[PDB]
């Protein structure tokens, strides 16, 4: 672990010891997402078992196009489909989902493994399976509901930003695929000025609630997406509106611990003093005088 | 002489000895896992072996502050006299358990009070090196020829301070009772006449004594 | 840990229990400083931290051309000035400073984390961050004051011969970028033959004392100078002269432990033999007959 020195944080670790980053002058990468271009051909999910080595299941039809219908050990993204009429005329919104590689990790957060869930300076948020205890805490700790378990090792997967390409200088294979140019990417700077070009042109189509999804709850993402309705995220299978880890997720894994720290070491005190000032209560502590 | 038990330690100075007892666990096998890196169990003794690093020095310090506490309370209690050469001088058999026999024993005896010399020699010892060699506050400011004797001796003084210790406490569970009256208090008057005559003589003539200054 | 099966030293392991190293048949390398040739360019500096990843702070002129001041967790190689007339004429000697890779490293001998530090098989000696614990021992066993603390994790750092690039075949890229060839790189058998040929053509340009720096006091360095003074090497900005490991370093991490290993066991048993022969000294062993 840590050969990169490039850490930035790492799962139940001490803030007093913190993870080696030395090598942390490095700029923040970004996937962006434009639905506005995208066709729902599911190039990117092919794309990604591919060249992830990993197989889902065949599964079933129930009425949608969405298939697999949901992220699974074996589906790193897949492409959710919606149809409506809330915005006055027929629309099918398509939108590819995954993991977001917060700037502030739920999942990290929530994870009591130390090592499990890391963050790497370019903004690539990983599982290092060596240390996972299959607990499951980080898939209530993320937002987005992306974390998923394999039965077969007890162990969490996700989208990995492909990390195994994007270290040696290569985007990830799904943006490589896409053929319509709905998913880019690059640095997160030139990412965000891409996509707010692509605002300002579907404004002009008359969207004029167009915007880019990069939410502030949690410190921004390294996968973005310009929406041609970004003030009704939810139309686009669910996506959260102003997402945020939950505060019973920060207090439980935040105040709670230092708390319980100071109730042991203080009850530890309290009854050694206690036992050491008062002494002992045997039958008789009269006739010893 | 008609009570089982005389206080022999006050509240205030078990609570200080149990305190330090406490620290020196974690700083002595802190210490011992940078000193024996193949006991790897003991990079735990701290939580993580970095976290060990961090902590062993604070631990140190408050050890040091609680034994000046004790310093200043039992110093005059131990001091050499002549009284301590027949002590010195039948080692041997004070260590088959005739020391009665073969000593003048006071309050505290001659061992006790090389002990007590030897650790607070030690830790002060301790306390000057391990500043020293403090990374990220202190050794900054010291000449790397001065860090790297500091290394040695605390190396050294740390383990002689574990060893004494070590002796310390099997004497503790050897000379039967000791440990009661660190922890309560008091100890039985024949454990007082056997142990430390001279010693309880004091306390029985100062008690009736004044008792009797008294005027009952 | 030891996946490329060459680690030939390791800090903090028993002698008896040595690390991973069958893959030992490989050439060793060196990088050799020809100060003579140098032109104080600081080109190195740059490069390295380009390649590396990091960047230091924006310093301050104090009054000299040196610039960090100092090595440090993110300046991993610096230039050294110094101007003289010790030798009769006003002379400007510039000198690369950075770990020389000691064959016998003081720094791995002063380490009490297992791992933290090793050496490979071609001489290169690195650190392995996963393992360090800040105590910063090493600072004070290496002869040549070469390692540094970085305050933001805690762990120290230094040139790491770029180990990236030479186990995969490429030079490192302060070599690479030298601008007039002053650091040369390659096997060290053939360094040592450039370095004498060198050495040869200063001494036939009045250098009656021009030597090679590959100090016997640790076993030889796998970076190497060439020095038109090798009789004061004090000049060269206090490179040391016969530099060593200290003798109280050897003593504290040599004879003092195996001494404290048997005073230990031979206490223990001592103290064992002694209560069971003897027996407790409670308040009556009399009447108990
Ligand atoms: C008088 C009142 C005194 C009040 C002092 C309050 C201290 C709070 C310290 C801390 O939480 O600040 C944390 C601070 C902030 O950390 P953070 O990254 O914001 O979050 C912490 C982690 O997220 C998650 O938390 P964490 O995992 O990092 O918890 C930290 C701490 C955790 O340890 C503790 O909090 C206390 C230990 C409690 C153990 C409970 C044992 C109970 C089990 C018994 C069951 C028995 C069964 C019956 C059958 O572990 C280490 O720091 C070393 C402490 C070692 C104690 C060794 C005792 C052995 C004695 C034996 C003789 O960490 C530290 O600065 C070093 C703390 C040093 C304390 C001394
Ligand atoms: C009668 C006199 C008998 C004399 C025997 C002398 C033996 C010296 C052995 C050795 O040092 O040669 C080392 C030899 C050479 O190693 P080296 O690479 O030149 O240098 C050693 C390392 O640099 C740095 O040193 P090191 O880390 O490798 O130290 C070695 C040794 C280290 O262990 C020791 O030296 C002795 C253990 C002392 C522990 C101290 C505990 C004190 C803490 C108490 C605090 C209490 C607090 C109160 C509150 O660890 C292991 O070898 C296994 C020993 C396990 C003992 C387990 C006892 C548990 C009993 C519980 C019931 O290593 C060995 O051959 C295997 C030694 C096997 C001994 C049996
Ligand atoms: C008086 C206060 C003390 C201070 C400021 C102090 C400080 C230090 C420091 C800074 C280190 C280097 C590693 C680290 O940063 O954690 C160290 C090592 C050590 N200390 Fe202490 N210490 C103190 C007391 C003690 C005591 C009382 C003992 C004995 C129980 C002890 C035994 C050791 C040992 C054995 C080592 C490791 C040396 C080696 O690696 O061979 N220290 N101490
Ligand atoms: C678990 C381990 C220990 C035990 C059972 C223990 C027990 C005792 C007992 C029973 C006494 C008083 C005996 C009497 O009344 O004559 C005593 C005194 C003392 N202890 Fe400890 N002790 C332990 C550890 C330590 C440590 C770690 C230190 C400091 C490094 C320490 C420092 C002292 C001092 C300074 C005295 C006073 C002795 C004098 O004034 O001569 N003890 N201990
Ligand atoms: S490959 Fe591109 S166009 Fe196709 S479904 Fe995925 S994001 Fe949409
Ligand atoms: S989307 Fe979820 S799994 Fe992905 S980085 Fe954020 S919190 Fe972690
Ligand atoms: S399941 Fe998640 S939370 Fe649990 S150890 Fe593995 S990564 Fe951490
Ligand atoms: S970035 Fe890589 S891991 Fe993530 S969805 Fe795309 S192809 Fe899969
Ligand atoms: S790059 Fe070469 S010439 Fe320039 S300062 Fe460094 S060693 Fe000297
Ligand atoms: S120069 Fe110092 S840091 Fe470098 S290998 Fe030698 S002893 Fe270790
Ligand atoms: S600071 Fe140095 S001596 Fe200490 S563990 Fe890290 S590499 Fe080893
Ligand atoms: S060899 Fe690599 S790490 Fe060392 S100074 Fe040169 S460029 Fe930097």
Known sequence: AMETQDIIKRSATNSITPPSQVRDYKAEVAKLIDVSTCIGCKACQVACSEWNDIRDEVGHCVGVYDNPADLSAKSWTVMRFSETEQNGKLEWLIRKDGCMHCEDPGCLKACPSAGAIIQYANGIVDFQSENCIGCGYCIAGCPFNIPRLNKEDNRVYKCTLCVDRVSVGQEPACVKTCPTGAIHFGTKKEMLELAEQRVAKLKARGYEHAGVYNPEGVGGTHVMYVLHHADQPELYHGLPKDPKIDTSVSLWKGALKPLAAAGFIATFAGLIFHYIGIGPNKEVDDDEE | ?216
């Open chain 2, 1 to 216: 002489s008609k009570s089982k038990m005389i206080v022999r330690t006050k509240f205030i100075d078990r609570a200080c000895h149990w305190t330090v007892v406490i620290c020196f666990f974690l700083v002595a096998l802190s210490g011992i896992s940078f000193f024996f890196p193949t006991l790897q169990w003991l990079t735990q003794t701290f939580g993580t072996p970095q976290m060990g690093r961090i902590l062993h020095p604070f631990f140190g310090i408050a050890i040091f502050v609680a034994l000046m506490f004790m310093f200043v309370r039992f110093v005059h209690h131990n001091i050499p006299d002549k009284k301590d050469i027949p002590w010195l001088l039948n080692i041997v058999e004070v260590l088959k358990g005739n020391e009665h026999k073969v000593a003048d024993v006071g309050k505290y005896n001659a061992g006790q009070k090389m002990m007590f010399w030897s650790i607070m020699s030690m830790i002060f010892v301790l306390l000057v090196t391990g500043v020293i060699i403090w990374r990220p506050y202190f050794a900054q400011y010291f000449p790397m020829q001065v860090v790297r004797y500091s290394l040695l001796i605390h190396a050294a003084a740390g383990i002689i301070l574990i060893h004494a210790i070590l002796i310390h406490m099997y004497m503790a569970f050897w000379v039967k009772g000791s440990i009661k009256g660190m922890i309560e208090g008091k100890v039985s008057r024949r454990w007082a006449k056997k142990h430390h005559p001279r010693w309880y003589r004091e306390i029985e003539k100062a008690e009736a004594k004044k008792e009797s200054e008294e005027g009952i």
